[PDB]
């Protein structure tokens, strides 16, 4: 009905610009109708590819990844944008990135190299890494 159609425009103009997670376009579509309204707008974006929260999540791994976080901190990025532990989980492992060899190029970037390897400044270098998201497991190699 006119409700519909009314927050379908919305919709598709907010998603048309740039990818959102569901939940990113929920809170836009609730900024400045009933429930099931809003719902079968969601639905049609999730069929005509405005919505996909598994492209959504690969992409941001992806990015993130790249920009010199780790995993710790892209999960909880993730959650703040309402995509589900679950599409977190696959496309983490889907994207089977050497989180290892990510945070020893930080390192190298803000360090040097070869890396400082006096205690007082291997302690912070580790401090460091683990601010940007990147798990013990992954940083106890890049010596």
Known sequence: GPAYARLLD??????????????????????????????????????????????FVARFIASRSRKGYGPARIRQELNQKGISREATEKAMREADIDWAALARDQATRKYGEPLPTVFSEKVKIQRFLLYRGYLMEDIQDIW
């Open 10 to 55: 919305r919709a598709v103009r907010i998603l048309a610009v740039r990818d959102h997670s569901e939940q990113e376009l929920r809170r836009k579509l609730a900024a400045p109708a009933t429930a099931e309204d809003y719902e079968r707008v969601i639905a049609w974006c999730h069929e005509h590819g405005y919505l996909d929260d598994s492209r």
